[PDB]
């Protein structure tokens, strides 16, 4: 990334021998708009994981059955989407 920016800047010096900057500043703000949100989500997730770590000792051995049935449900849905997409690819192959 740095080397590409450097080749670009060398070219800009070659040709040289304010709209773009404000555009760059706008995009800079834009990117981090979502990154502050990612921070918010990571922070909620970390506080929640610490909440779980509080229960972490011996707790209830039923949430395991709960998450395992959730695993059956999520794997079923993922296999649905997988077979669907693969059948669409076979459809394009036939066409």
């Amino acid at each position: 990334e740095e080397l590409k920016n450097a080749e670009i800047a060398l070219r800009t010096q070659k040709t040289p021998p304010n709209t773009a900057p404000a555009d760059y500043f706008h995009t800079l703000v834009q990117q981090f708009e979502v990154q502050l949100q990612q921070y918010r989500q990571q922070i909620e997730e970390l506080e929640n994981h610490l909440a779980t770590q509080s229960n972490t000792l011996h707790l209830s051995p039923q949430d395991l059955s709960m998450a395992m049935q959730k695993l059956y449900q999520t794997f079923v849905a993922l296999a649905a989407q997988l077979q669907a997409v693969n059948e669409n690819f076979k459809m394009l192959k036939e066409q």
């Binding site: 989500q41 990571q42 909620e44 997730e45 970390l46 929640n48 994981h49 909440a51 779980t52 229960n55 949430d63 998450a67 959730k70």
Partner: peptide
């Protein structure tokens, strides 16, 4: 993302 996925799910739980 599985720690963050358990985070989203358990955060939905707790």
């Amino acid at each position: 993302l599985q720690e963050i996925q358990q985070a989203g799910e358990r955060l939905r739980s707790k």
